[PDB]
Design an enzyme around this catalytic site. Structure first.
Site, short mmCIF file in Angstrom:
data_model
loop_
_atom_site.label_atom_id
_atom_site.label_comp_id
_atom_site.label_asym_id
_atom_site.label_seq_id
_atom_site.Cartn_x
_atom_site.Cartn_y
_atom_site.Cartn_z
N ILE A 188 60.12 5.89 26.36
CA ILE A 188 59.34 6.44 25.25
C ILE A 188 57.88 5.99 25.33
O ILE A 188 56.96 6.78 25.06
CB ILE A 188 60.02 6.06 23.91
CG1 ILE A 188 61.40 6.72 23.80
CG2 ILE A 188 59.18 6.45 22.72
CD1 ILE A 188 61.41 8.29 23.77
N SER B 4 64.88 9.10 14.91
CA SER B 4 65.32 9.26 16.28
C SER B 4 65.11 10.70 16.75
O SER B 4 64.85 11.60 15.95
CB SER B 4 66.80 8.87 16.43
OG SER B 4 67.64 9.81 15.77
N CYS B 5 65.17 10.87 18.07
CA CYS B 5 65.18 12.20 18.68
C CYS B 5 66.15 13.14 17.98
O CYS B 5 65.78 14.25 17.58
CB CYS B 5 65.49 12.09 20.18
SG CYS B 5 66.90 11.06 20.59
N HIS C 144 74.50 15.00 24.28
CA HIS C 144 73.33 14.14 24.42
C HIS C 144 73.19 13.65 25.84
O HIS C 144 74.17 13.18 26.44
CB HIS C 144 73.45 12.95 23.46
CG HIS C 144 72.15 12.30 23.10
ND1 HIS C 144 71.35 11.67 24.03
CD2 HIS C 144 71.53 12.14 21.91
CE1 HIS C 144 70.29 11.16 23.42
NE2 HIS C 144 70.38 11.43 22.13
N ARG D 162 77.72 11.58 24.92
CA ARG D 162 76.83 11.34 26.04
C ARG D 162 77.41 12.02 27.28
O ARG D 162 78.59 11.83 27.60
CB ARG D 162 76.65 9.83 26.25
CG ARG D 162 75.98 9.11 25.04
CD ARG D 162 74.60 9.74 24.79
NE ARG D 162 73.80 9.21 23.69
CZ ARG D 162 72.91 8.22 23.83
NH1 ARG D 162 72.75 7.64 25.02
NH2 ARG D 162 72.20 7.79 22.80
N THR E 129 75.39 8.36 16.53
CA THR E 129 74.05 8.93 16.62
C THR E 129 73.17 8.40 15.50
O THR E 129 73.63 8.20 14.36
CB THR E 129 74.10 10.45 16.59
OG1 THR E 129 72.79 10.96 16.86
CG2 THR E 129 74.56 10.95 15.23
N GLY E 130 71.89 8.14 15.84
CA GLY E 130 70.93 7.67 14.85
C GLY E 130 70.72 8.65 13.71
O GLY E 130 70.37 8.24 12.59
N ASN F 111 65.00 15.10 24.34
CA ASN F 111 65.08 13.86 23.58
C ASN F 111 64.01 12.87 24.00
O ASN F 111 63.71 11.94 23.24
CB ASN F 111 66.47 13.25 23.72
CG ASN F 111 66.96 13.24 25.15
OD1 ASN F 111 67.47 14.25 25.64
ND2 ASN F 111 66.83 12.09 25.82
N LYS G 144 55.42 -11.85 25.26
CA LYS G 144 56.76 -11.74 24.70
C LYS G 144 56.71 -11.68 23.19
O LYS G 144 57.51 -10.97 22.56
CB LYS G 144 57.64 -12.92 25.12
CG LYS G 144 58.47 -12.76 26.40
CD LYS G 144 59.17 -14.09 26.76
CE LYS G 144 60.58 -13.90 27.30
NZ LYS G 144 60.63 -13.46 28.72
N1 LIG Z 1 64.87 7.20 25.30
C1 LIG Z 1 65.27 8.07 24.38
O1 LIG Z 1 65.89 9.10 24.66
C2 LIG Z 1 64.95 7.76 22.94
C3 LIG Z 1 64.92 8.74 21.95
C4 LIG Z 1 64.51 8.42 20.68
C5 LIG Z 1 64.30 7.10 20.36
N2 LIG Z 1 64.37 6.12 21.29
C6 LIG Z 1 64.17 4.69 20.91
O2 LIG Z 1 62.95 4.23 21.51
C7 LIG Z 1 63.08 2.85 21.91
C8 LIG Z 1 62.72 2.74 23.37
O3 LIG Z 1 63.67 3.51 24.15
P1 LIG Z 1 63.42 3.80 25.71
O4 LIG Z 1 64.33 4.91 26.13
O5 LIG Z 1 61.95 3.94 25.95
O6 LIG Z 1 63.95 2.43 26.38
P2 LIG Z 1 63.61 1.58 27.71
O7 LIG Z 1 64.62 0.48 27.88
O8 LIG Z 1 63.42 2.53 28.84
O9 LIG Z 1 62.20 0.93 27.32
C9 LIG Z 1 62.16 -0.42 26.80
C10 LIG Z 1 61.05 -1.18 27.48
O10 LIG Z 1 60.74 -2.34 26.67
C11 LIG Z 1 60.44 -3.42 27.51
N3 LIG Z 1 60.68 -4.63 26.74
C12 LIG Z 1 61.89 -5.24 26.54
N4 LIG Z 1 61.80 -6.31 25.78
C13 LIG Z 1 60.45 -6.40 25.46
C14 LIG Z 1 59.72 -7.31 24.68
N5 LIG Z 1 60.27 -8.35 24.06
N6 LIG Z 1 58.39 -7.11 24.56
C15 LIG Z 1 57.84 -6.05 25.18
N7 LIG Z 1 58.43 -5.13 25.94
C16 LIG Z 1 59.75 -5.36 26.04
C17 LIG Z 1 61.37 -3.25 28.70
O11 LIG Z 1 60.94 -3.93 29.86
C18 LIG Z 1 61.33 -1.73 28.89
O12 LIG Z 1 60.28 -1.40 29.79
C19 LIG Z 1 64.51 2.43 21.53
O13 LIG Z 1 64.52 1.83 20.25
C20 LIG Z 1 65.24 3.78 21.49
O14 LIG Z 1 66.44 3.79 20.72
C21 LIG Z 1 64.67 6.45 22.59
#
Ligand SMILES: NC(=O)c1ccc[n+]([C@@H]2O[C@H](COP(=O)([O-])OP(=O)(O)OC[C@H]3O[C@@H](n4cnc5c(N)ncnc54)[C@H](O)[C@@H]3O)[C@@H](O)[C@H]2O)c1
Ligand SMILES: NC(=O)c1ccc[n+]([C@@H]2O[C@H](COP(=O)([O-])OP(=O)(O)OC[C@H]3O[C@@H](n4cnc5c(N)ncnc54)[C@H](O)[C@@H]3O)[C@@H](O)[C@H]2O)c1
Ligand SMILES: NC(=O)c1ccc[n+]([C@@H]2O[C@H](COP(=O)([O-])OP(=O)(O)OC[C@H]3O[C@@H](n4cnc5c(N)ncnc54)[C@H](O)[C@@H]3O)[C@@H](O)[C@H]2O)c1
Ligand SMILES: NC(=O)c1ccc[n+]([C@@H]2O[C@H](COP(=O)([O-])OP(=O)(O)OC[C@H]3O[C@@H](n4cnc5c(N)ncnc54)[C@H](O)[C@@H]3O)[C@@H](O)[C@H]2O)c1
Lengths: 332, 332, 332, 332
Positions: free
Chosen positions: B11, B149-150, B177, B232, B209-210, B314, B77
């Site tokens: 995202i 959420s998406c 999904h 999924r 699902t969210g 999504n 962090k």
């Molecule tokens: N991917 C989707 O389809 C989707 C859809 C809607 C909502 N979301 C929500 O968006 C969020 C991100 O999802 P995503 O798919 O991008 O996941 P992802 O795991 O690909 O991205 C997470 C990133 O965060 C980094 N990270 C982990 N811990 C960290 C910390 N403490 N500080 C900083 N960076 C840190 C990781 O290294 C990774 O690069 C989630 O909450 C997810 O539920 C995702």
């Protein structure tokens, strides 16, 4: 009870596999003009989805020998020309996909078949789902019958139980359905159904399901009250029904589980199964049931509005049902 | 506008990509302690799902430079330690997944962020769906908000149009999904949700699902009346909502299409789209909409009971909504 | 330079797409008896692998209109009956897969095509690979030519450069190759090549490659010194050559990189590309090159024994080469 | 012969499965701090690739009961703290992937294990391939050993036979390799190996293979003469080696087949298999061999230059080898 198979495809080959677990039923003949004798052995012996055949196979004296039983093999395009009577084939499984009407499937009668089972829905042949309407089979007024579709064999037994115990006022269903032989590897021509031409492995593909029409035939009380659709998705086998319905008699999820579970242990045993485990689709590869109710995956919105979930190995469960339908028809 | 991104995951990277097509907004800072600068550039230039970045990229004097704009990059962090203020990040996108409540998300305010947008649902922070409840934003009360959420962003605009006109009595939805990063390539540990550990490419996997919780918050009229689930399946991106509802006011599918099509053209333009073509899931890779109603795929059982189908990318649709929300949050 | 396309399949449609990046070439006519006019628009407009067409499309007055250019569309089975001269089609791309001999492809010459390009290897028509042997095209003696295969267009330019600079004493190659239209979704009949019938998405499948024979034709000096095979694997597009050879002149990996890179910037520009990035197959979806050398993936065992790695978009690169071959042939 | 398993992952669980076919070997204890007792039962009982476990399972009195045998289960992070001696575990399979050096793996000796088998290559522990160098195991000065890698167990037995009978002057190999647990579902961070982060299901991914280094250890005569690489591709299990080498003694393909076949029936029986059937990868799901030579897939360029092809179930074959190595070590 001697059986002939027309079309040695997914269903044809797995009907063959299933027949070996039924000691009364014996496949004596197979017809497919696109698969010669030695190639039939290969295709039967190796299966990407269900693994290697565990018994013995051999080609001998122009016949396919499976667990010591010799099988006659033919390569004819017109089903009227297949000499079933010569091979001993009383019952013929029509599983090519292209002779689904009574007129076309009836061609096997010219070769001396007594009964024909179309492994797919029919526009006019009577349709059956084991556990639901097989009592309505009339031996000597019906000769050509259909075993409905895989989705109809999943939906109908579940629907029966829910309708019998609670009443389905109205309902709609979705099957998340494995891709099949009619689909394409990459985007290609599918002139009647455009979406079905799109690459099967890259796409979630909306489609019709045979259960949409068929469920109203096999359960007359639900005609006009229950229909649905499919999405073809990228798994090679195993599908799942998502049935959403309003109920007449208010109920609870616990009682729904109780009736389905009880049906799985008694009247629908072997057809309808019940699980409470945290399953996914690959857990049903080579499952023999028509319908496996997933207790944990269901949702009850309120006492009269529910979503039920049921798995089916669209290849293997349906194939076992074709054999059960044969054995049931033969005992007349 | 000025935006900061915390977490360069799916995202975060695609919000950055979407931000370059919105001239209002410009990302000025990114923080992720697990991706150094040269690796961030690689991860941004190549994408298995959305293709290569079509602008220019460079690493120069410790900044990531995307189409000539230098972006400062941090490896922290503790979000409290990100110096948003010393890079002019007015709006911070929280897209790591682990800072979803207002207390943890608030840490960005303690580093000179003025407003924080969680790219995920929150238990307490207010959730927004562009085109549904976006004006319920209060630029005096709310310093951290969630874009839901998406699946919520796909279900809420379709639900609003149907409810506002035909009043949804009861309703249940399924989303078919795409698999995501929280899933596993092969059967692996997922201690809280066992089904989510099973191989993503091999399985249809039932899941929560969210949108089940969130849809009742973004449309309060629909709280106890609408919920659902997900399956999924093995596609890397693009999902599809399957909504079955009983209506208060009877209607026809052609009137359903009428209201959806011109809501598509007016107040939900850019969010809810409408198509009549024979689309499949890969036709929506890199689509920017929240929800694409599939006219041909819906089913009407009777004048008060209907099944609706709506696609959403999504990844990319949600990411454009995060940025659309930043603009809507700004602008007061 | 006016072009006709026979067979609107993967290659036919992507030749069409590629032609739009060559302003001198104009496709004036398309023939396919399995894809009527409105269906041609749909199949051109949506592509699971290469995404939606970015220009405009329309069906009008019995013609396919693409970016304002009207295209005549025919539905004839016998290529001798296609009226190319009436439509203005000088050059005809024969891309159906079933008219690959000179005798069969020559049918388009009745219908007044000047030149035919077979989009596949031929048993007897002269074969060409742009950048390797196109100088041997004799415009007064060769009216039917072949553009070889996708794997031959990847292997030949690389092999040429390595052979020209270092000498290949002996060599064997493997292509890890995307699945194609000739393969099956689930285990089905493929009577001549049994492995090619096994489900494409479940299997790594050993197979023949057209480059095994063709490379010896396009580079006579290497006939008998270089052959290989393929493994079909579950990606929808993009393939990769793995060339292992002993060299005459001892060398180092750095010098191999230098010559390949230099060729990519000069004599083989547009055909052979060179990268040092950490790429994977999806990074070449819709790449226009015949051969992209992967510097980091190569291995040098000793000064005279090496493994070289080169990517190719088997659909898109080859399609662009068909158009380059037309333009090269037209400039006589 | 009593066995402990550290890490209940793909290899840990399938070592457990394989152990049940070896009547001498009994697993008495398992450690995994990320998989509690009831979850261990679930993960053992259902497997997406190898199907449901066919025996019985139960959780009782804090122990995992498999086919009536109670197994002690621990949840400890530091292997030095696992009380193997208390549980009766003589031999410990170290299969977590993170204790691969002699120093780290030696920690199991503090808990009273007699011998440790690292289920992966080691920088310093002696490595073994059954059928190749197990004679060099000294039960006098070797308490920590390694069973090499899956690719090394495929390559080494084949290489041995070809080298012993014909002499490998020089050679390079490729494994077309199933994706594993270390890979990602969608493009994510993999900071040391950037390509391994790219979505496993979308991509053919070049990678290192453990056999590149290990083969020189297990066959000293071939060190510096034989190395290779991998491509990770979208199948969940089953891989294949493509070995290209120049030979010292000129030979023919028929004689290569004859020696490999003879080895498969005698000295390498159970480890090296030989087939002439038209196989594909799914035909080896749950195969127990280290190496299955594919006669038909090979190519001989000339009497001293050949490409050989050998399949392996990278999960199941290797797991069975871990058990054979234990039984071999226990005899002494
Ligand atoms: N991917 C989707 O389809 C989707 C859809 C809607 C909502 N979301 C929500 O968006 C969020 C991100 O999802 P995503 O798919 O991008 O996941 P992802 O795991 O690909 O991205 C997470 C990133 O965060 C980094 N990270 C982990 N811990 C960290 C910390 N403490 N500080 C900083 N960076 C840190 C990781 O290294 C990774 O690069 C989630 O909450 C997810 O539920 C995702
Ligand atoms: N596999 C499933 O999921 C499933 C489930 C339920 C019902 N069905 C139905 O079962 C039928 C068979 O489906 P399938 O999946 O096995 O397809 P398939 O392609 O595997 O089998 C068709 C076979 O019939 C042969 N054939 C075609 N025309 C023929 C002719 N004129 N004479 C003789 N043989 C001929 C082909 O060679 C092929 O082997 C279809 O009607 C399908 O709708 C399939
Ligand atoms: N796609 C690749 O990766 C690739 C690469 C190099 C070469 N090729 C070659 O290009 C050719 C086409 O391959 P493809 O992938 O497009 O296959 P495809 O199945 O997508 O295309 C074949 C098309 O030709 C049509 N057709 C069949 N018979 C016909 C006739 N008599 N008249 C008119 N049209 C007819 C079909 O309707 C179909 O649309 C093949 O020879 C193939 O070997 C393909
Ligand atoms: N699957 C294959 O193809 C294959 C083949 C040959 C060798 N191997 C090797 O075997 C080893 C295990 O592979 P796998 O496929 O089982 O991986 P996996 O990820 O499926 O299993 C690893 C297990 O170890 C556990 N673990 C992690 N940290 C731990 C700790 N501190 N203490 C105890 N347990 C811990 C994890 O929870 C997990 O259950 C790896 O080193 C791998 O390289 C794998």
């Amino acid at each position: 009870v001697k059986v002939g198979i027309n079309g040695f495809g997914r269903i044809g080959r797995l009907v063959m596999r299933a027949s070996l677990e039924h000691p009364e039923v014996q496949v004596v003949a197979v017809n497919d003009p696109f698969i010669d004798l030695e190639y039939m052995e290969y295709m039967f012996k190796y299966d990407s989805t269900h693994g290697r055949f565990k018994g013995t196979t051999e080609v001998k004296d122009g016949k396919l020998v499976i667990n010591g039983n010799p099988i006659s093999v033919y390569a004819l395009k017109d089903p009227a020309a297949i000499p079933w009577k010569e091979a001993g084939a009383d019952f013929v499984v029509e599983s090519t996909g292209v002779f689904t009407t009574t007129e076309k499937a009836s061609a096997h009668l010219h070769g001396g078949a007594k009964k024909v089972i179309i492994s797919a829905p029919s526009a006019d042949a009577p349709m059956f789902v084991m556990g639901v309407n097989e009592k309505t089979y009339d031996a000597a007024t019906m000769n050509v019958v259909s075993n409905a579709s895989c989705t109809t064999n999943c939906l109908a037994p579940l629907a029966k139980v829910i309708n019998d115990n609670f009443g389905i006022e109205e309902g709609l269903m979705t099957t998340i359905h494995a891709y099949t032989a009619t689909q394409k590897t990459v985007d290609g021509p599918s002139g009647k159904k455009w979406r079905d031409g799109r690459g099967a492995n890259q796409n979630v593909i909306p489609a019709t399901t045979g259960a949409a029409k068929a469920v109203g035939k096999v359960i007359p009380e639900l005609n006009g009250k229950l229909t649905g659709m499919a999405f073809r998705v990228p798994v090679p086998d195993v599908s799942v029904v998502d049935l959403t319905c309003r109920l007449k008699k208010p109920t609870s999820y616990e009682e729904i589980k109780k009736v389905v579970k009880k049906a799985s242990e008694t009247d629908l045993k072997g057809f309808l199964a019940y699980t409470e485990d945290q399953v996914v689709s690959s857990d049903f590869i080579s499952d023999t049931h028509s319908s496996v109710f997933d207790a944990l995956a269901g949702i009850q919105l309120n006492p009269t509005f529910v979503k039920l979930v049921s798995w089916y190995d669209n290849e293997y469960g349906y194939s076992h049902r074709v054999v059960d339908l044969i054995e049931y028809m033969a005992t007349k």
